[PDB]
């Protein structure tokens, strides 16, 4: 009494499509701000806001998940701005976002030591001890 | 320099997007049907189906161009998309199931409605190219 | 003692102010994008949807009323965005709105069949076939 | 080459009937009215309760509110406007004037009529105020 | 185990100083005050200069705003909230009244004095309102 | 020319700010611990702590710069702040109580986490400059 609409290639077009959101940023709702506080206040008063998508963050990081679930919700259809621990440089946050969007990132020899710590504190899957 | 990766990103991501269909978290669009609310009685219009912009954009060329040509430039607001009358509320929900999980079991009676709607909205995998 | 007050010319002034309302656009809180997709839009410049007001829509369209009163997720305050079926062009929706505001629109015969269909789609009083 | 007046006879009656439903309902309200109560000869300002109203009706039915909402611009879609009405206006008088602009008819107790009529003169409401 | 007690007695001084500086830097402001008038009904200057203020001081000083924010029929989560005060307060008077709540002191010309006192009375502002 | 006085301004005001320590009324920023790096088995133990922007900018050189440097270009958004790894939920509440009310009593075991946080957050009376 039923037919079945299979589609083998769904996941593959989903993979290619999502990966662009690391680059075209369309439908972004989360803006991540760095707090490294490197070399004085006046250099980056308009701090560069990293664009991100809530669902990716919740999927890849437990810390973002428990946040978006239990956090006090104020604007359900407006942007959220989040500013990350001062231990994390802006390039580190960019690498982490890339890794959360591709699952596969390259990192300079002088940023790996920090990205691992960021992932551990952000409980990003693939970077947690847990 | 170092290359950082882990074994299985797509499995967890696919599992997450799978539930996103039913946990309805983070929705950004609302889908309504002009199709007959049981006909004359007007009793039961499609109250609305909440969805996610990035999925309908990724898997439907109609919805993608809709979201590109119809910008919600305000700081806040949810897109109330009213679809053509071809799409009964059953058809809309099944097609959204398909745009999420890449699969949909379909009852025989609505086959000619869903196979139609998929081409109407050009959902990849349903639409004939 | 109990007392009574009334205004005779209330109705005419009110309705005439309403007629001008969509022209001056004051207090508009709905935007009706028109996805007519004529011959295939290559994601060109935005269609510039029509401004409208919720109270008049819901007082005229039996469908817009339900859409506005019970949307599963809603914008709490301020402008709201609707995009209409591909059946209805920007000109038709523009005429179809003026009709709901003023009760009459000098529709052209050449698009009469699109306006007449559109009324049933939005179940607009005066046009709805029921 | 030809045109037609697509028209409805009962639009005016249906619409007026669908607007008189508003003030008795919170639907689509976009302004909230307050006042110094004048509850006991000396206003009681603590217990004030906002009265939801609609810009599109106040602006047409009274001139004071029109220039208010005109010259107090809406700088954000998410902005909600509250109006602190003059102290001479009690909540009940404001309660009725909120009806008067919608229903076009009101019945009042004589003990407030002399403050409600003055309120009409202040807010420059059609029918009540001179022009 | 020890329940050691922290303090620095100059804290409240710095808190007050920061609030006083808040008055003129206007950062983190979330509520904007307008003054109702027909004066701006002419092409020369239609849009009123909306005064910025902070929610927490208004409720801290004025119980009228305290209620206006504690309970209201509708509200916004995070967007700035706009209020227009009665026509009895000119822009100078409302600015002075904001200063008084913000810092507890002010200076007024005698031609400003009466209007400021009356407006503060209606706004239930501590130190001006009599009861 | 004339002058206004309100001698009870501060005392009334101070009481009306201590109260804000308890309730979200007028809250502007949310502080989240990140302390699980300490080895805690939990997934996430914390739920965002509510705070008011202007107060933290008053007491903290770290926050006072931060809320200035975070643009919040969207006027209808709100700010979530992830505090450093070293600061637990318990310790931050003591730090905020100190920030909001000028006094806090801290257990000897958390003493070296509240005091440590003070320099990490450059909160005056705990920071060394």
Residue numbers in the entry:
A (entry chain B), C (entry chain F): 4 to 133
B (entry chain A), F (entry chain C): 5 to 133
D (entry chain E), E (entry chain D): 3 to 133
Give the published text.
BTB (bric-a-brack, Tramtrack, and broad complex) is a diverse group of protein-protein interaction domains found within metazoan proteins. TTK-type BTB domains contain a highly conserved N-terminal FxLRWN motif, where x is a hydrophilic residue.
To enhance particle contrast on cryo-EM images, we used the BTB domain of CG67651-133 fused to MBP (40 kDa), which resulted in a monomer Mw of 56 kDa. Iterative masked refinement excluding flexible MBP regions resulted in a final reconstruction of core CG67651-133 multimer at a resolution of 3.3 Å (full data processing flowchart is shown at Figure 3—figure supplement 1). The map clearly shows the hexameric assembly consisting of three dimers. CG6765 hexamer consists of three canonical BTB dimers with extensive hydrophobic molecular contacts and main-chain hydrogen bonds (N78, V82, Y84, V86) forming a β-sheet between two parallel β4-strands. In addition, a bifurcated hydrogen bond is formed from the side chain hydroxy group of Y84 of one dimer to the sidechain of T77 and main-chains of either N78 or I76 of the second dimer. Furthermore, a few inter-dimer hydrogen bonds are formed between (i) T50 and T73, (ii) N78 and N80, and (iii) side chain hydroxy group of Y36 and P75/M70 main chain atoms. Interdimeric interactions were further strengthened by hydrophobic contacts between A2 (F66, M70, P75), the loop preceding B1 (I48), and B2/B1/B3 sheet (V34, V86), with the B3 strand formed by residues highly conserved only within the TTK group. Residues with large hydrophobic or aromatic side-chains at positions corresponding to Y84 and V86 of CG6765 are characteristic for all TTK-type BTBs, whereas residues involved in stabilizing interactions at B1/A2 and adjacent loops are less conserved. The N-terminal TTK-motif is located within the first β-strand and is involved only in intra-dimer stabilization forming antiparallel beta-sheet with B4. Central part of the hexamer forms a pore, residues of loop regions surrounding the pore are not conserved, thus it is unlikely that it can possess some physiological function.
